[PDB]
Amino acid sequence: EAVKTFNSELYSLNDYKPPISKAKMTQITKAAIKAIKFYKHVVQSVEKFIQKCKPEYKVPGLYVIDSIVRQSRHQFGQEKDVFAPRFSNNIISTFQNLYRCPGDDKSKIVRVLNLWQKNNVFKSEIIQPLLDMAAAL
Ligand SMILES: [N+]
Ligand SMILES: [N+]
Ligand SMILES: [N+]
Ligand SMILES: [N+]
Ligand SMILES: [N+]
Ligand SMILES: [N+]
């Protein structure tokens, strides 16, 4: 139900040509956060979206992760945020999927990683392999 509403908004990305509207991203993020009880379902849905989506939607999918983790850290506290730790479990595979984006979108991913590193959204042991994966392409 809370997960149904989130899935609905997430998959609605398919109706749009990137870049995605701020208002749409906000709606997806707010739905994720309202559904914090079901954070595992939320993370699983985002990961599935990114695995299966067309190449033009990989960066939008990453922005969904970025938007959820930023809002959750702001709203619940960096130490208490449940989203970044849960996304970390499969993150190497998530990014393997993300890097199968158009070559003109690769820089957008590295930008996100650079900001995550600066703000310590993940520790170096997670961020560095993700940075290494960009360089290896
Ligand atoms: N998808
Ligand atoms: N993309
Ligand atoms: N939290
Ligand atoms: N959280
Ligand atoms: N992930
Ligand atoms: N970021």
Swiss-Prot record:
Q: What does this protein do?
A: Anti-terminator protein required to prevent early mRNA termination during transcription. Together with SCAF4, acts by suppressing the use of early, alternative poly(A) sites, thereby preventing the accumulation of non-functional truncated proteins. Mechanistically, associates with the phosphorylated C-terminal heptapeptide repeat domain (CTD) of the largest RNA polymerase II subunit (POLR2A), and subsequently binds nascent RNA upstream of early polyadenylation sites to prevent premature mRNA transcript cleavage and polyadenylation.
Protein name, entry field: SR-related and CTD-associated factor 8
Cross-link of type Glycyl lysine isopeptide (Lys-Gly) (interchain with G-Cter in SUMO1): positions? K17
Q: How does it assemble?
A: Interacts with POLR2A; via C-terminal heptapeptide repeat domain (CTD) phosphorylated at 'Ser-2' and 'Ser-5'. Identified in a complex with CDC5L and other spliceosomal proteins.
Q: Which residues carry this modification: Phosphothreonine?
A: T5
Q: Which residues of the full protein are shown?
A: 2 to 136 of 1271
Q: Where in the cell is it found?
A: Nucleus; Nucleus matrix
Using the record's annotation, list all stretches that form the CID domain: 1-135
